[PDB]
């Protein structure tokens, strides 16, 4: 009964530590499938302009990432967090 044992060190120790602390956050997940056809088409038009101009390519994560920022501004509750301030449960509203 002798498997390999190697201590977790460095950045991997920090990831593992944060995953242990994450156990105190009661989470739920929402799942939604979205039509992506128009994204494929319009991303291709932007990249075709760039290949003919000064190069560069935009990704799907750039578009979704920007849509995510517009959505957080339309629904600000998504940018808030929980913490125990002054021994009480409190809502943290970032700047």
């Amino acid at each position: 009964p002798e498997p390999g044992q190697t201590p977790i060190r460095g950045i991997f120790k920090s990831i593992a530590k944060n995953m242990d602390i994450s156990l105190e956050i009661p989470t739920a997940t929402s799942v939604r499938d979205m039509p992506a056809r128009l994204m494929f088409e319009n991303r291709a038009m932007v990249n075709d302009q760039l290949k003919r101009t000064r190069g560069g390519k935009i990704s799907f994560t750039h578009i979704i990432g920007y849509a995510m920022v517009k959505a957080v501004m339309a629904h600000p509750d998504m940018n808030n967090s929980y913490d125990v301030i002054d021994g009480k449960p409190t809502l943290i509203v970032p700047e």
Binding site: I25, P26, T27, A28, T29, S30, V31, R32, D33, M34, P35, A36, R37, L38, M39, F40, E41, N42, M45, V46, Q49, L50, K51, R52, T53, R54, G55, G56, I58, F60, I63, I64, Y66, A67, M68, K70, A71, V72, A74, H75, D77, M78, N80, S81, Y82, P89, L91
Partner: protein
């Protein structure tokens, strides 16, 4: 494991699944659901894609979300044909021809909804469906995506063409087939040759503005692609085995033309009288064994008065050579300004002589340096025509509108226009869409009368600098 055509017949679209994992102590499920709904709506929203395209400088309208149209009696193949005609006739109305992101207030805008696939009851869902195209591109069937790529390459990039008003079927089909064959991919050697001509054009402009006084009136800054445009036409004429090119032009860029086109030495130019005298020179081609004489005609400050005189000079030289109907080996290259071309009546009065028995010279190559201004007057007060070069449609002649900040497209247009003149013996019109960097004279702030236009002009890269950075980027 399915084929793309079978999926296109059903209308199966691509998806993305997005999740939201949240702290339930401060965020509720309904809020998380609303957040994901807004993300889905944004990815298919008109305003969202307008904002992205504006930021990335895509001078085209994005594709719009729509539902796949229900199967009623309506046939789509005959409507694909109507879309092909619309692009051939009016595709120049949405072509990337203006180096400025400028729309002149005061000028009326024609409706061109016929260029949108939604007007012909077609959507993004038809892009990968096959249609009957009636011999378009030499094919019987094609996908709507292939139809749009061919139509976009031919009619909506840096060259906007006007040719469907031509009555003769053979001449109209020659232009159609060459424009739909596309603009060839330029070689590295070709790209370096264009960069050398642009270096020469800008080096001369900087010498004139800094070593001499009172030359802001005569600046070519903003229209430096005129040098490789004129060189392209004269070089193409030398390859055709022709004998001479006679130039008629106003003051703007005259000393630049004398040094880089006519070939006069710097000592001979520098010793406003020079801006009205005539000159003679020679043009040899770097990639060939052809030679051609180049002449410049004398003219007064009265704009466009040189037009009839210059035509007569050409006819006299052609009559002395006497080579018959298949001759016409003295090419008239006539330069204009956009305000003067549209406004002065001598311009169409002289073009009316082009096919007449005693006045025919085999066609004239017209270049309009369209800098979208005339002293302090904008096109909304200069003409009742959509484009400055619209007298061409009266004489049944083709027009090529080209972006002055794309020197590859400018040299291509110069070659095609000179090829058209040798084959059909008619006038050809090149509208070089550029801008004027300085004011009309030395003591003139152009922002006094046109502040909004000069927000886009002041502090932008030159055509040379922009082209170098563009080549390095791709």
């Amino acid at each position: 494991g399915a084929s793309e055509d079978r999926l296109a017949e059903l209308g199966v679209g691509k998806l993305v699944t997005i999740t939201s994992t949240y702290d339930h102590r401060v965020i509720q499920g309904a809020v998380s659901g609303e957040f994901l709904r807004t993300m889905s709506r944004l990815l298919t929203d008109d305003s969202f894609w307008d904002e992205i395209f504006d930021a990335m400088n895509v001078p085209y309208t994005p594709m719009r979300w729509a539902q796949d149209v229900p199967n009623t009696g309506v046939d789509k193949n005959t409507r694909v044909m109507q879309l092909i005609e619309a692009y051939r006739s009016r595709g120049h109305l949405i072509a990337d021809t203006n180096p400025l992101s400028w729309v002149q207030p005061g000028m009326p805008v024609p409706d061109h909804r016929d260029l949108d696939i939604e007007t012909h009851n077609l959507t993004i869902w038809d892009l990968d469906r096959t249609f009957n195209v009636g011999g378009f591109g030499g094919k019987e069937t094609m996908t709507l995506r292939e139809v749009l790529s061919r139509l976009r390459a031919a009619y909506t990039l840096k060259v906007g063409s006007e040719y469907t008003h031509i009555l003769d079927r053979d001449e109209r089909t020659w232009l159609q087939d060459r424009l739909e064959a596309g603009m060839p991919k330029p070689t590295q050697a070709e790209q370096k040759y264009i960069l050398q001509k642009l270096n020469a054009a800008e080096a001369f402009e900087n010498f004139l503005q800094t070593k001499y006084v009172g030359q802001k009136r005569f600046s070519l800054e903003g229209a430096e692609a005129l040098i490789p445009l004129m060189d392209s036409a004269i070089d193409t004429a030398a390859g055709q085995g022709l004998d001479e090119v006679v130039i008629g032009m106003p003051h703007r860029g005259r000393l630049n033309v004398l040094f880089n086109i006519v070939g006069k030495p710097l000592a001979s130019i520098f010793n406003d009288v020079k801006y009205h005298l005539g000159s003679e020179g020679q043009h040899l081609q770097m990639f060939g064994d052809g030679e051609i004489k180049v002449s410049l005609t004398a003219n007064p400050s009265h704009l466009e008065a040189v037009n009839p005189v210059m035509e007569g000079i050409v006819r006299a030289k052609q009559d002395y050579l006497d080579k018959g109907v298949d001759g016409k080996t003295v090419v008239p290259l006539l330069l204009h300004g956009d305000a003067a071309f549209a406004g002065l009546g001598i311009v169409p009065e002289t073009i009316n002589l082009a096919k007449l028995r005693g006045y025919d010279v085999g066609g004239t190559i017209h270049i309009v340096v369209n800098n979208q201004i005339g002293f302090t007057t904008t096109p909304d007060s200069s003409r009742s025509m959509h484009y400055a070069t619209d007298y061409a449609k009266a004489f049944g002649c083709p027009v090529f509108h080209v972006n002055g900040d794309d020197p590859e497209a400018v040299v291509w247009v110069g070659q095609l226009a000179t090829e058209y003149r040798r084959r059909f013996g008619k006038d050809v019109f090149i509208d070089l869409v550029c801008y004027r960097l300085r004011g009309h004279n030395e003591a003139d702030d152009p922002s006094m009368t046109q502040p909004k236009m000069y927000e886009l002009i002041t502090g932008r890269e030159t055509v040379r600098a922009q082209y170098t950075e563009d080549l390095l980027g791709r």
